[PDB]
Ligand binder design. Structure first.
Ligand SMILES: COC(=O)c1ccc(O)c(OC)c1
Ligand SMILES: COC(=O)c1ccc(O)c(OC)c1
Lengths: 208, 208
């Protein structure tokens, strides 16, 4: 049982701007997703300070990067707070409609695509490299869900019955055919060291 | 009725490090506080998406900067989410104990004080310039409280009976005697334009 939703107009415009603008510095998508993971891990850590049972669903707070050259996917897994169904539908827990407005203004006023995360909409930079993005997520207060979108104006939500994850978010990037450099160990290491060296959680790059 | 609490050891060490290290670039405190305000304004905006009555306590989302040369105070007011008493006691809603550990590591590994906000403890940069900091805060789910600290290991919390604020946080910076440049309109404008030009809420600098 799949539900199909329309992106808000402003988010659909932001997505096609990302997909359609000539912009070579695509590697910033990973920085953006790891930061979001870091924020989600901060929120569950904070909750746990006053309610340690919040961590019943898994105590280890970390980030895994899993390339798979067969499936052509790069997956970012965190054991952060997770998202509820309502969070997923509301632009994955973000204020994306006003974040998009602020980002658009900035882009006229001289800004570039790499500053996207300053406007709270760094998630959508996933579309610099992915033809399709699948987000599996489990929050303590809800069931496990899968969100999916290949852009074009709509996303689906379904309850996910695949591999239980306990708590956190997996962002599965189905990479565009010319973006397979982001599955190479060397290149992912370079990028993590470049843009994500002061993240306060361990980041494990899986090998194949 | 005032309660006096001990800072966690790690926070007390972070504070005296801020107070005691030779570091000229003190102006970053304002960037750090405005960002925290921006995050708080993002959280109430998000909550309001699905429950517009959240905004009953005030619909305008913004930031005010109020210098007062008489009192020698610079106050940053936001109409963000606010903090509960429990948030105030738990390091003002932050994961400051692990943020301090990550920041300390980074400072050995070559980092400088200006990167503090990357470790989620930018609030404490207030002590680059303030001999004392008072935080008045009102969350929808709680009463209005005042938190206060001149560092030295302890902070107080009291319910605040002064001017009702509706919803949000006021950070009152009692500036060190040699830090009065941060009360000059020109200097605050310069800093806001330098470090806080893509904040997605209006920032009003009051005049005297
Ligand atoms: C709370 O939201 C999250 O847990 C979360 C985590 C990772 C992400 O890449 C993400 O995109 C918005 C959201
Ligand atoms: C939710 O926390 C807040 O609303 C908040 C707002 C402004 C600040 O400067 C701050 O320091 C921690 C916290």
């Amino acid at each position: 049982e799949v539900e199909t939703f329309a992106f808000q107009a402003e988010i659909a415009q932001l997505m096609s701007l990302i997909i359609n603008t000539f912009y070579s510095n695509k590697e910033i998508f990973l920085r953006e997703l790891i930061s979001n993971s870091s924020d989600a891990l901060d929120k569950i850590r904070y909750e746990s300070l006053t309610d340690p049972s919040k961590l019943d669903s898994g105590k280890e707070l970390h980030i895994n990067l899993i390339p798979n050259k067969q499936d052509r996917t790069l997956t970012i897994v965190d054991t952060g707070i997770g998202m509820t169904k309502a969070d997923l539908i509301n632009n994955l827990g973000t204020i994306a409609k006003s974040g998009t407005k602020a980002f658009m203004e900035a882009l006229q006023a001289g800004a570039d695509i790499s500053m996207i995360g300053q406007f709270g909409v760094g998630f959508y930079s996933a579309y610099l490299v992915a033809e399709k993005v699948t987000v599996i997520t489990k929050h303590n207060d809800d069931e496990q869900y899968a969100w999916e979108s290949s852009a074009g104006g709509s996303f689906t939500v379904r309850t996910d019955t695949g591999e239980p994850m306990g708590r956190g978010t997996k962002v599965i990037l189905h990479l565009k055919e010319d973006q397979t450099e982001y599955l190479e160990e060397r290149r992912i290491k370079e990028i993590v060291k470049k843009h994500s060296q002061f993240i306060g959680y361990p980041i494990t790059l899986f090998v194949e």
